[PDB]
Design a protein around this ligand. Structure first.
Ligand SMILES: CCCCCCCCCCCCCCCCCCCC(=O)O[C@H](COC(=O)CCCCCCCCCCCCCC)COP(=O)(O)OCCN
Ligand SMILES: *[C@@H]1O[C@H](CO)[C@@H](O)[C@H](O)[C@H]1NC(C)=O
Ligand SMILES: *[C@@H]1O[C@H](CO)[C@@H](O)[C@H](O)[C@H]1NC(C)=O
Length: 165
C-alpha cells in the first residue's frame, strides 16, 4: 500500500525546464508527467479520479511545479548554478496494515536534500556547497515547503491510497 512519485527536471537554463516523471500505486504505473514548464502533460493512465477531483489534483501538481521552478530560479539568482543540470524528486506515502511519508531530492544524480516530516524540516543529504545551504534555508523558511507539504504527504497522499488502491 504505497504511492510513489518520481520527477526528473531537466534544466537547460533557469527559465526552461523539461519535466519527465511518473507515479505508481502499489506497484502499478498510474500517472505520467512530461513536457516543458510552459506546457506540461499530466496524465492518469487509469481513470482513478472523477473530473472535479482530477482537476484539483492536476491543478495542485501544476501549482507545485511553479513553486518548484520558482525555487530553482531563486537559488540561481542568489547562488550561481551550473547548467545544464537535472533534478530528481522522489516522494510518497506508505500505509501499514500511521503512514510513513518521504521526499528526497537529488541533483545530477547525487543525494542533495530530504524532508524530515516529524518537524517538517529539510536536511542536507550530502557531506559536501553554498547551493545546498541556501536551498535548505529557503525550504525551511516558508509554510508551503514545510507544513503544507507535510499535509500533502500525510493527508492528501494517504487519502488517495485509501480511496484508490
Ligand atoms: C498525482 C501524481 C501525478 C503526477 C505524477 C508525476 C510526479 C509528480 C510529483 C510531484 C507531486 C505533487 C506535489 C504536490 O502537488 O504538492 C502540493 C503542495 O506542495 C508544496 O507545497 C511543495 C512546494 C515545493 C517543494 C519543492 C521541493 C524541491 C526542492 C529542490 C530544490 C532544488 C534547488 C536547486 C538545486 C499539494 O498541495 P495540495 O493543496 O493539493 O495538498
Ligand atoms: C518512471 O520514470 C523513470 C525516470 O525516467 C524511468 O526510469 C522509469 O522507467 C519510469 N517507470 C514507469 C513505471 O513509468
Ligand atoms: C551537472 O552535469 C552537467 C553535465 O556535465 C554539468 O555541465 C553541470 O555543471 C552539472 N551541474 C551541477 C549543479 O552539478
Amino acid at each position: 500500500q504505497r504511492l510513489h512519485m518520481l520527477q526528473i527536471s531537466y534544466f537547460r537554463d533557469p527559465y526552461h525546464v523539461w519535466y519527465q516523471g511518473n507515479a505508481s500505486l502499489g506497484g502499478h504505473l498510474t500517472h505520467v508527467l512530461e513536457g516543458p514548464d510552459t506546457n506540461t502533460t499530466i496524465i492518469q493512465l487509469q481513470p482513478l479520479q472523477e473530473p472535479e477531483s482530477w482537476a484539483r489534483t492536476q491543478s495542485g501538481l501544476q501549482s507545485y511545479l511553479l513553486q518548484f521552478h520558482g525555487l530553482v530560479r531563486l537559488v540561481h539568482q542568489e547562488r550561481t548554478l551550473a547548467f545544464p543540470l537535472t533534478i530528481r524528486c522522489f516522494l510518497g506515502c506508505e500505509l501499514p496494515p500511521r503512514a510513513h511519508v518521504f521526499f528526497e531530492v537529488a541533483v545530477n544524480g547525487s543525494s542533495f536534500v530530504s524532508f524530515r516530516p516529524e518537524r517538517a524540516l529539510w536536511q542536507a543529504d550530502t557531506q559536501v556547497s553554498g547551493v545546498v545551504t541556501f536551498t535548505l534555508q529557503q525550504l525551511n523558511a516558508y509554510n508551503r515547503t514545510r507544513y503544507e507539504l507535510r499535509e500533502f504527504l500525510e493527508d492528501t497522499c494517504v487519502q488517495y491510497v485509501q480511496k484508490h488502491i
